Enzyme design. Structure first.
Site, short mmCIF file in Angstrom:
data_model
loop_
_atom_site.label_atom_id
_atom_site.label_comp_id
_atom_site.label_asym_id
_atom_site.label_seq_id
_atom_site.Cartn_x
_atom_site.Cartn_y
_atom_site.Cartn_z
N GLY A 100 0.79 -1.23 0.00
CA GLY A 100 0.00 0.00 0.00
C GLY A 100 0.82 1.27 0.00
O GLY A 100 2.05 1.23 0.09
N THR A 101 0.13 2.41 -0.09
CA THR A 101 0.78 3.73 -0.11
C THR A 101 1.32 4.08 1.28
O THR A 101 0.91 3.48 2.27
CB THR A 101 -0.17 4.86 -0.58
OG1 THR A 101 -1.25 5.02 0.35
CG2 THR A 101 -0.73 4.58 -1.98
N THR A 102 2.23 5.05 1.34
CA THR A 102 2.85 5.43 2.60
C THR A 102 1.91 6.31 3.43
O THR A 102 1.30 7.25 2.90
CB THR A 102 4.20 6.15 2.38
OG1 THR A 102 5.01 5.39 1.47
CG2 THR A 102 4.95 6.33 3.70
N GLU B 78 0.16 9.50 1.67
CA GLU B 78 0.44 9.60 0.24
C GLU B 78 -0.76 9.06 -0.55
O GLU B 78 -1.18 7.92 -0.32
CB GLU B 78 1.71 8.81 -0.10
CG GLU B 78 2.03 8.61 -1.58
CD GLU B 78 3.22 7.69 -1.82
OE1 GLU B 78 4.00 7.96 -2.75
OE2 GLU B 78 3.38 6.68 -1.10
N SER C 131 -2.62 1.98 5.67
CA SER C 131 -2.01 1.56 4.41
C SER C 131 -2.35 0.11 4.16
O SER C 131 -2.34 -0.70 5.09
CB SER C 131 -0.50 1.72 4.47
OG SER C 131 -0.15 3.07 4.69
#
Ligand SMILES: [Cl-]
Ligand SMILES: [Mg+2]
Lengths: 243, 231, 235, 241, 229, 250, 111, 240, 244
Positions: free
Chosen positions: A29-31, A46, A74
């Site tokens: 996943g995204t940060t 993010e 995330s």
């Protein structure tokens, strides 16, 4: 072998492989990050711009629980939403019976026990999210991070997702360079920088920054989103540091 | 492989194969386009027939006076999810005298789909949805995936060959967003967008399906000779 | 083993796709829609000469304005018919009117995907639902175990379906009479049936606005078979 | 080989899932120790904070179950907190129904019975934790009762749990072989904690700072945990003789 | 089925050209005993709505908690919670009306009479009533309990029909409300001198006035009254 | 969630074996030896207190348990399984008998109830069999003294004397040579101690041996006087000292 | 004891012409001897060229109309936007009323 | 509750549990049904592997569902009892509510419906039973004979057989049974039914059971000696 | 999920057999032999206890022969614990019938009820079947003396003489040879013991290895007596019939 095909099965090591596989979805996943400041907490995330056709500022990721707790995660976004919905039910029943808003450590355990319950049976799948959450209560500011296993601890700073190693290093510098502490406004600026720096792991697509905060002085202990001039100021500060 | 027998099982790389297989059913489905301006929101859908004797499968469903969607994938699953939306729109009206916000409608669809991805015995939904609506914050377009992921967009497309229409909208972004107070021109842009996904076949009178909602426009569906104007 | 509600890598439900194979083994059923009425015809396919063929009931009345023909595991159709009859009657009780043919079909197709681990498996039978209402006139629908239904001007299901459907492709036009449609079903049934077509191993029916749903007598069908033979010998 | 996945018997009459739950017990790499004084029961546990980003005040494997009962856990924190919440609920329910405070040994039995059920029922997995319950019981006096994933429990004169339990166990055995009594003959709990820390240092061969340990103390009518500064005072007294 | 124990008396209200006014006293009666003297019975919801409640106080406090929970719930996953997707008076009323009718339909009513006063997004005045039976109605003036019998007649002399609303200023409206509260204090045996008043205006927003007192009272004529005949 | 294991986990294999029951019996075989001997005027049950650690207080672990005032039980196999069976056995003695008839159940019927619980864990959904064999000794007015064995299958058999667990084969042979129908209770205790010494490796004393009897009524253990018909429990657990006294005359 | 019913007064009148129909009602709403409102609409346009009024206990009246309006909406969804005829609306309202046979809507309804 | 889908489709569109239930029927003792002009006869095979049997008390193969309808079967004996019980309950329930006994077709439709239900209900297996249901409708003199099978399909038969070696006895019936002129009397119908079983049975001793059903609730089971006289007469004509 | 571990106890094989029923029958074939013989003036029930010990208390022991009511008894072959579950259910059914109709339950009705319970475990519930076969010996005023058997399939049949458990093939052949219809109880006692003596896997047939019972109208006048034989009484009948 076969110990990793079913949830709640101990391997010969004493490991639950299905929980460890849920961690891989989190790492994909995204940060997202969390920073504990002097009188509160800051959350940042993010958001990858997959296409120009995404409406800017509309696909909001950070979620509020009650009026004083912020949650970011995330991994599998729907799993995070399901966990927040439960958190909202837990916070509501707590306030119904006990009047006072749910304390953050109390709230942490409610999520923790619920996530842990999804590692006890093969009829359910573990959560595919690591959740960073916290807020302000009667005893002050609290920041937590909760894993797919149900494990959680309190944090000075927290990070998860694809750019977590980068983020963690940046957070560790802030802890060392500020033993006396960090202000809320500083923490927003630093949060912006850390997401921009952590974006090197997701450098292919451009992104959108999203920040929120709970502070005793700046927001009266309520969760609010960083918007307008204060968001742009944090973006400008972040852009200046990468160059 | 060994981890695709049910929805309750992660793979060693943290993937949910049953959800990904449900996502594949959408790609097999017929193309549908969604786009909006500041005043109106439009759905355009290429309907698919079984053969020359058969009718063209309906793609667009009305949910309320101010909201509706187009589907791509398993049609019965769209009926279940659209029925749920109809009820939630209706609950909001009856209890709170309030038209259900499009963003909140997306959140409810996400949570409904999610429960089917974490429990044994069930299965994920095998359909993708494009929800348009006009509420108190203007026009809206949403994309629903049966993974649970719901996204708010200016424009999009789902189904087979949807990438062509999606690229066109990505170029035209600055033009079609400005088409305010002109429903016919906004539909023209949607018809021109869906044309970028056609091969061998073209848009005929019983092939094309269009829906629109806007400022002083209830959600209405156009089929048959009503869309000949746009061919 | 594996889930009953499992998706294949191609995005299809295994059990639904497998039930479609059971329907291909079923006896042929054909429907043709005209502006004068909708005709429904079936192959009876008795397993032995001692079996009394008039007890083979593969064409069924749902209401006065709606009929239904079946193909596949015909035992599975009984609960579908029961539900359809109940839905038709219940709507008349609630609304003092006839139910739309599409709405009836949609009600039947809602049962289709109610299986899991509700019933243990999908239905192993396809239905041709024919009828008339005031809004959309004469209609023919094909209800599958997937929960999908298509409207058709003409449709064939069962073992001889693709050969019959190709024949219906050429023969159907928008000006067909009811008499022309009756002969056309008989012609195509005779083409795809193993045994030689007669009044005892095939059955006709229709739905008109005036007279409603009627299963044809064996004497009435026998005359239409004789009329067919003569007109084919005419050129 | 599905007899290794769920809690059914293997051909040798063994429950592999139970045995593997015992192995999960040592996943934290933490050692705990419990001893009894005249008037008190002391429990000590290693504390390890590997990440600088952690809030060290929230990292704990010692739980205040009731006013009188304390519990240290050896195993992963999610299962530890699962057991902690349940033990708290059970202890409160007991007091409500029967009008007196739940004894330490009775709570141990209850949690052990729950653990037994997870070894017999297939849908429930065992918890990968060993629970050491401590109190000063009003009838039995200083008490140490320890539960495991098999559903086994017993009282102890003293006990140790973790990767290096055997070293600590033998060290404690040798002391009680000399003294020939079932407890630490000491008046104050402070000196019983000092004994506990000293004998852990001797057994493991490692020194401790104030942040490396975690201490729980049970007295008559209350169980409490020591702060870092209370532990520091304890470490100073050990070093000064 | 229950009986009301600790109760609150009249809530009164009216429309004026640019908004609405609502008022209620600060007493909680225990039968004839004037038990609690500091009870707030006007409860604001956001900056555009005030809900005035009479009848059972325990049920009022429950409703107060429902409205508090409603604000929390509306803010969830709502970026426009303080703007286009804020709670309207009409939304708050309909919710309460639903609850009241559902509760009477289970033979377990919230023993209250409620007036929701506010201003909508488009500036339109909102004023509507609901009670323990789920009965609802709107009018240029609304009042509960004794207020219905004594306040409405006085308030209806200012705004008699719809066309009188644009002709009625905020000064004239407030004056009429304050006078009505004095009349109620003269004549209602379960009323108090202390009251709260709230104005919701489309231009100046929500003004909440606490610790108001009935003043300019006529008692001097009592000295001349002797005997009973 | 929900318990979705509604099916049997014990099933017949092609050879007609119930695997899980056989495997449970294997677990019993690995268990520590316990025995029972019946005399004319009593019954004795005994076992070794195999302490897992010397730091453990083995007095707090009771292998021999009172079920009713006149009925006692010992086991071989999985200790936790035994503990929950004792709890269930104590409760069922009240719910299915004492709360109906106002008296404690006879030995054979309590055994029957315990057997039923063990049978159900062999057929019910989502559960494994109990990994224990029980030896239940008791007395009642009309049947006198009795001794029963109960296995994981739920089968039970009455015995004059028997042994279960680790060294049961050798112990049963030892008992066959010594048992007669004229044994007094003290003679049966003596034989029990002799039999148990063979299967014990280490220390053999009152602190490592657990032994109880079903014998005469103990009015001193009743806890109240004044009702002539209540004369006290026949179950008595022997003390550490009482065992050591009989080890000198061994 | 709690009385779930009340009386809000009012009077309504429906007349069917040759090619038209009127449904009239006064706008006064009352309890006992007090006026609640001088203008509280009681006759409602329910869509599909149907007008309705449920007179008596106003809470039950509002509930019934609200549910019927909802039934019109769902009739459109379920039956391809077909116009609900007046006879079909009448039969539907019977079922809404008889559904509460043992705890009735205390109203006299006219469409 | 146990919800497992035991009857499911296979890649070739077959439900194996239903097909394997038919294999249980193939193993069962042979049963035959023949309708004459004014009667129906039900013949049943008794395997002579079991002697020392008490024939007084042993469950008979033909069961009365009502006074005017009978049911025989081939397949699992235990399974058939469940269908017989349900049918008998429904027969009395029909009399109670409609004030008229069940038609043979209605009773068949009910039993067949039960069998179907067990092919798409969770946690259950199909009945390993096929039935022959015979009788006369109330106030009607037209003979009725129906068949059901595990799948739940049913149909009417001039004559039919089920069970082991039913292929052989169906072969016999297909060449010996004329539709234009069915067995005009009870004698002729019983004779043809015994003849059909003698193709498969072995000894004509206690291995053949015969039950005759006539109109107006006239049902009787033939004895050993009565059947033995048919067996004698058939073979004496055959010696030619 | 849980499906992975399901044995599916209630399915057909490709040949149309019930796996678990067939395997339960295999289990029963290793159990001690039980024989029932019906005579004109009574019924005999004989049964062999499995490899006993000298330290087994025989006079208080019961593994084979159980009383269901005053008129009906059963001989067991298979899992004793499984049998006791069913036996108690049958005892309750008999009393339910007696309470409802004020008449003792007819033998077949009791047998059918128990057999239907067995049948249910083969068709639904996903549980293993009962590994038990019964011989029912009983009397009622309709059919008189009756012998039935039931097995894990839930199928039951009536018999003049029958065996269950081990060596039934051999035992049934011996019974089929020496059984006659005009036989009496005393003769049937002798036949049952002689059959067990020849079919037994033990070296010799003794009193301590047997359970024995008769149902006689040898009860003073117009009534029926059940006699569960004592150890000494089995020893006496063994000497009388000339086996020991
Ligand atoms: Cl417990
Ligand atoms: Mg388990």
């Amino acid at each position: 072998t076969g110990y990793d095909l079913s949830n709640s099965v101990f391997s010969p090591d004493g490991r639950n492989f299905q929980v460890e596989y849920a961690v891989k979805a989190v790492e994909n996943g995204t940060t997202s990050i969390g920073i504990k400041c002097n009188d509160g907490v800051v959350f940042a995330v993010e958001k990858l711009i997959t296409s120009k056709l995404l409406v800017p500022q509309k696909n909001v990721k950070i979620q509020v629980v009650d009026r004083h707790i912020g949650c970011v995660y995330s991994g599998l976004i729907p799993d995070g939403r399901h966990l927040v919905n439960r958190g909202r039910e837990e916070a509501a029943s707590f306030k119904k019976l006990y009047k006072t808003p749910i304390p953050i450590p109390a709230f942490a355990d409610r999520l923790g026990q619920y996530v842990q319950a999804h590692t006890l049976y093969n009829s359910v799948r573990p959560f595919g999210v690591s959740t960073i959450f916290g807020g302000v209560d009667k005893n002050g500011a609290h920041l937590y991070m909760l894993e797919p296993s149900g494990s959680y601890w309190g944090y000075k700073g927290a990070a998860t997702g694809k750019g977590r190693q980068s983020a963690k290093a940046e957070l560790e510098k802030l802890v060392d360079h500020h033993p006396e502490g960090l202000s809320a406004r500083e923490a927003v600026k630093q949060a912006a920088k850390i997401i921009y720096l952590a974006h090197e792991d997701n450098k292919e697509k451009d992104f959108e920054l999203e920040i929120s905060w709970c502070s005793l002085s700046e927001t009266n202990g309520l969760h609010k989103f960083v918007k307008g001039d204060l968001l742009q100021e944090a973006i400008d500060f972040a852009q200046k540091e990468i160059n | 492989n060994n981890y695709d027998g049910d929805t309750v099982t992660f793979s060693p790389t943290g993937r949910l194969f049953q959800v990904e297989y449900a996502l594949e059913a959408i790609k097999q489905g017929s193309v549908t386009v969604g786009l909006r301006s500041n005043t109106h929101a439009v759905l355009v859908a290429l309907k698919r027939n079984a053969d020359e004797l058969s009718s063209y499968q309906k793609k667009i469903i009305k949910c309320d006076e101010h909201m509706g969607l187009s589907l791509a994938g398993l049609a019965p699953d769209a009926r279940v999810l659209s029925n749920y939306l109809r009820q939630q729109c209706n609950y909001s009206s009856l209890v709170f005298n309030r038209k259900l916000a499009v963003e909140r409608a997306g959140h409810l669809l996400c949570d409904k789909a999610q429960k089917n991805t974490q429990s044994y015995g069930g299965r994920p939904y095998g359909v993708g949805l494009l929800i348009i609506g006009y509420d108190k914050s203007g026009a809206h377009l949403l994309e629903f995936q049966p993974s649970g992921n719901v996204t708010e967009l200016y424009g999009t497309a789902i189904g087979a060959r949807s990438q062509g229409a999606k690229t066109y909208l990505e170029r035209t972004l600055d033009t079609f967003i400005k088409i305010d107070g002109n429903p016919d021109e906004l539909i023209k842009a949607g018809v021109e967008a869906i044309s970028q996904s056609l091969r061998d076949e073209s848009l005929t009178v019983d092939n094309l399906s269009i829906a629109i909602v806007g400022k002083d426009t209830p959600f209405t569906i156009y089929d048959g000779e009503a869309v000949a104007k746009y061919i | 083993d594996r889930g009953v509600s499992t998706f294949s890598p191609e995005g299809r439900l295994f059990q639904v796709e497998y039930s479609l194979e059971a329907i291909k083994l079923g006896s042929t059923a054909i429907g043709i829609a005209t502006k004068e009425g909708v005709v429904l015809g079936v192959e009876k396919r008795a397993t032995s000469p001692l079996l009394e063929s008039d007890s083979i009931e593969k064409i069924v009345e749902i209401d006065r304005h709606i009929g239904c023909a079946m193909s596949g595991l015909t035992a599975d159709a009984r609960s579908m018919i029961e539900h359809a009859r109940t839905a038709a009657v219940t709507h008349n009780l609630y609304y003092d009117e006839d139910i739309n043919v599409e709405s009836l079909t949609q009600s039947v197709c809602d049962l289709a995907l109610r299986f899991g681990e509700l019933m243990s498996r999908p239905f192993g039978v396809a239905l041709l639902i024919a009828g008339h209402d005031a809004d959309d006139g004469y209609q023919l629908f094909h209800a599958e175990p997937s929960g999908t239904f298509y409207r058709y001007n003409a449709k064939a299901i069962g073992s001889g379906s693709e050969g019959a459907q190709a024949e219906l492709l050429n023969e159907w036009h928008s000006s067909l009479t009811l008499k022309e449609a009756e002969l056309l079903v008989l012609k195509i049934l005779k083409q795809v049936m193993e045994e030689k077509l007669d009044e005892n191993n095939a059955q006709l029916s229709c739905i008109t606005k005036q007279d409603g749903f009627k299963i044809y007598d064996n004497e009435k069908t026998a005359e239409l078979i004789k009329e067919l033979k003569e007109k084919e010998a005419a050129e | 080989g599905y007899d290794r996945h769920i809690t059914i018997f293997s051909p040798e009459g063994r429950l592999y899932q139970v045995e593997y739950a015992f192995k999960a017990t040592n996943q934290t790499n933490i050692n705990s120790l419990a001893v009894r004084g005249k008037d008190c029961t002391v429990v000590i546990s290693q504390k390890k904070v590997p990440d600088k980003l952690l809030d060290p005040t929230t990292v704990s494997y010692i739980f205040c179950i009731s006013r009188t009962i304390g519990m240290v856990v050896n195993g992963p924190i999610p299962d530890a907190r699962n057991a902690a919440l349940r033990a708290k609920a059970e202890a409160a329910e007991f007091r409500y129904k029967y009008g007196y405070d739940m004894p330490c040994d009775v709570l141990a039995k209850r949690m052990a019975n729950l653990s037994q059920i997870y070894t017999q029922r297939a849908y429930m997995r065992p918890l990968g934790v060993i629970l050491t319950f401590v109190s000063v019981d009003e009838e039995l006096g200083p008490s140490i009762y320890k539960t495991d994933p098999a559903g086994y429990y017993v009282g102890y004169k003293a006990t140790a749990t973790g990767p290096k339990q055997q070293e600590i166990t033998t060290n404690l055995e040798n002391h009680f072989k000399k003294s020939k009594i079932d407890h630490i003959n000491e008046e104050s709990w402070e000196k019983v904690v000092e004994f506990a820390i000293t004998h852990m240092i001797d057994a493991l061969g490692t020194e401790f700072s104030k942040n490396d340990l975690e201490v729980g103390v049970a007295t008559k009518d209350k169980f409490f945990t020591l702060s870092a500064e209370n532990i520091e005072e304890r470490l100073v007294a050990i070093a000064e003789q | 089925t229950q009986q009301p124990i600790v109760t609150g008396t009249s809530v009164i209200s009216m429309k004026y050209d640019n908004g609405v006014i609502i008022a209620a006293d600060n007493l909680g009666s225990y039968g004839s005993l004037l038990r609690f003297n500091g009870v707030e019975r006007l409860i604001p919801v956001g900056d555009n709505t005030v809900v005035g409640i009479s009848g059972d106080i325990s049920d009022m406090q429950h409703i107060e908690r429902l409205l508090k929970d409603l604000v929390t719930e509306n803010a969830y996953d709502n970026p426009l919670a303080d703007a286009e997707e804020a709670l309207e008076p009409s939304y708050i009323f309909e919710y309460l009306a639903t609850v009241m009718y559902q509760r009477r339909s289970k033979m377990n009513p919230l023993w209250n009479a409620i007036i929701v006063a506010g201003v909508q997004s488009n500036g339109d005045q909102f004023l509507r009533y609901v009670n323990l039976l789920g009965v609802t109605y709107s009018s240029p003036t609304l009042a509960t309990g004794f207020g219905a019998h004594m306040a409405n007649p006085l308030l209806r002399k200012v705004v008699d029909r719809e066309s009188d609303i644009p002709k009625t200023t905020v000064q004239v409206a407030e004056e009429a409300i304050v006078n009505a509260m004095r009349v109620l204090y003269y004549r209602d045996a379960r009323s108090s001198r202390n009251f709260s008043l709230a104005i919701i205006d489309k231009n100046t927003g929500l003004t909440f006035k606490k610790n108001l007192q009935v003043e300019n009272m006529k008692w001097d004529f009592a000295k001349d009254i002797k005997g009973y005949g | 969630m929900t318990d979705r294991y509604s099916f049997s986990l014990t099933t017949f294999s092609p050879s007609g074996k119930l695997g899980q029951i056989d495997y449970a019996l294997t677990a019993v075989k690995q268990g520590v030896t316990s025995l029972g001997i019946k005399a004319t005027n009593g019954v004795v049950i005994a076992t070794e207190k195999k302490s897992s650690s010397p730091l453990a207080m083995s007095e707090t672990l009771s292998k021999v348990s009172l079920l009713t005032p006149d009925i006692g039980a010992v086991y071989s196999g999985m200790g936790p399984d035994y503990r929950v069976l004792v709890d269930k056995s104590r409760k069922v003695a009240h719910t299915s008998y004492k709360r109906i008839y106002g008296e404690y159940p006879p030995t054979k019927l309590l055994v029957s109830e315990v057997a039923k619980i063990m049978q159900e864990a062999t057929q019910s959904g989502g559960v494994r069999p109990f990994g224990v064999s029980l030896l239940i000794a008791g007395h009642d007015e009309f049947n006198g003294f009795s001794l029963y064995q109960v296995d994981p299958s739920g089968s039970y058999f009455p015995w004059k004397a028997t042994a279960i667990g680790k060294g049961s084969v050798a112990a049963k042979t030892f008992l066959e040579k010594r048992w007669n129908d004229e044994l007094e209770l003290e003679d049966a205790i003596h034989i029990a101690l002799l039999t148990l010494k063979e299967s014990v490796e280490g220390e053999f004393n009152g602190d490592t041996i657990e032994l109880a009897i079903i014998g005469d009524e103990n009015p001193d253990l009743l806890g109240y006087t004044g009702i002539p018909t209540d004369k006290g429990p026949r179950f008595r657990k022997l003390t550490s000292q009482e065992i050591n006294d009989r080890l000198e005359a061994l | 004891q709690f009385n779930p019913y009340g009386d809000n007064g009012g009077t309504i009148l429906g007349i069917a012409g040759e090619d038209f129909a009127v449904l009239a009602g006064d706008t006064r709403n009352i309890t006992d001897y007090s006026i609640n409102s001088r203008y509280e609409p009681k006759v409602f346009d329910c869509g599909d060229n149907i007008v309705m009024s449920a007179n008596g206990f106003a809470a039950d009246g509002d509930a019934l109309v609200k549910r019927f309006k909802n039934s019109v909406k769902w009739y459109h969804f379920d039956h391809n936007d077909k116009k609900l005829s007046i006879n079909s609306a009448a039969r539907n309202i019977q079922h809404l009323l008889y559904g509460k046979r043992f705890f009735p809507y205390y109203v006299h309804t006219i469409i | 509750g146990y919800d497992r889908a035991l009857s499911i489709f296979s890649p070739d569109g077959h439900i194996f549990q239903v097909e394997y239930a038919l294999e249980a029927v193939k193993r069962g003792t042979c049963a035959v049904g023949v309708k004459g002009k004014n009667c129906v006869v039900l013949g049943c095979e008794r395997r002579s592997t079991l002697k020392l049997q008490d024939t007084r008390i042993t469950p008979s193969k033909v069961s009365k569902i009502d006074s005017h309808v009978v049911l025989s079967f081939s397949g699992l004996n235990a399974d058939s009892r469940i269908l017989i019980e349900k049918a008998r309950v429904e027969a009395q329930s029909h009399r109670l509510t409609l004030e008229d006994p069940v038609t043979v077709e209605y009773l068949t439709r009910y039993v067949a419906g039960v069998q179907q239900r067990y092919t798409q209900s969770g946690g259950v297996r199909p009945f390993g039973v096929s039935t022959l249901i015979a009788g006369f409708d109330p106030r009607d003199d037209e003979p009725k004979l129906y068949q059901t099978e595990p799948s739940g399909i049913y149909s009417s038969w001039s004559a039919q057989t089920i069970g082991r070696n039913s292929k052989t006895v169906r072969e016999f019936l297909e060449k010996n049974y004329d539709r234009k002129e069915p067995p005009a009397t009870v004698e002729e119908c019983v004779k043809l039914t015994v003849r059909s079983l003698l193709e498969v049975v072995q000894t004509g001793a206690k291995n053949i059971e015969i039950t005759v059903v006539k109109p107006d609730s006239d049902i009787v089971a033939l004895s050993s000696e009565e059947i033995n006289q048919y067996v004698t007469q058939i073979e004496q004509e055959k010696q030619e | 999920g849980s499906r992975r571990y399901d044995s599916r106890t209630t399915i057909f094989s490709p040949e149309g057999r019930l796996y678990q029923v067939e395997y339960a029958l295999e289990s029963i074939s290793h159990a001690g032999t039980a024989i029932g013989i019906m005579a004109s003036d009574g019924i005999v029930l004989a049964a062999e206890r499995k490899v006993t010990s000298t330290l087994l208390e025989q006079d208080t022991s019961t593994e084979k022969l159980y009383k269901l009511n005053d008129k009906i008894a059963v001989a067991v072959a298979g899992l004793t614990a499984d049998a006791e579950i069913l036996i108690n259910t049958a005892r309750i059914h008999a009393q339910n019938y007696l309470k409802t109709y004020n008449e003792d339950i007819p033998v077949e009705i009791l047998v059918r009820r128990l057999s239907d319970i067995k049948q249910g475990y083969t068709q639904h519930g996903g549980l293993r079947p009962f590994g038990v076969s019964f011989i029912y010996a009983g009397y009622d005023d309709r059919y008189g003396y009756q012998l039935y058997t039931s097995n894990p399939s839930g199928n039951y049949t009536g018999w003049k003489a029958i065996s269950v458990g081990a060596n039934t093939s051999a035992a049934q052949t011996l019974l089929q040879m020496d059984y006659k219809d005009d036989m009496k109880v005393d003769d049937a006692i002798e036949l049952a013991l002689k059959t067990l003596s020849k079919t037994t896997d033990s070296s010799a047939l003794t009193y301590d290895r047997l359970e024995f019972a008769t149902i006689r109208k040898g009860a003073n006048d117009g009534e029926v007596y059940q006699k569960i034989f004592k150890p000494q009484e089995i020893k006496d009948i063994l000497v009388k019939t000339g086996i020991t």
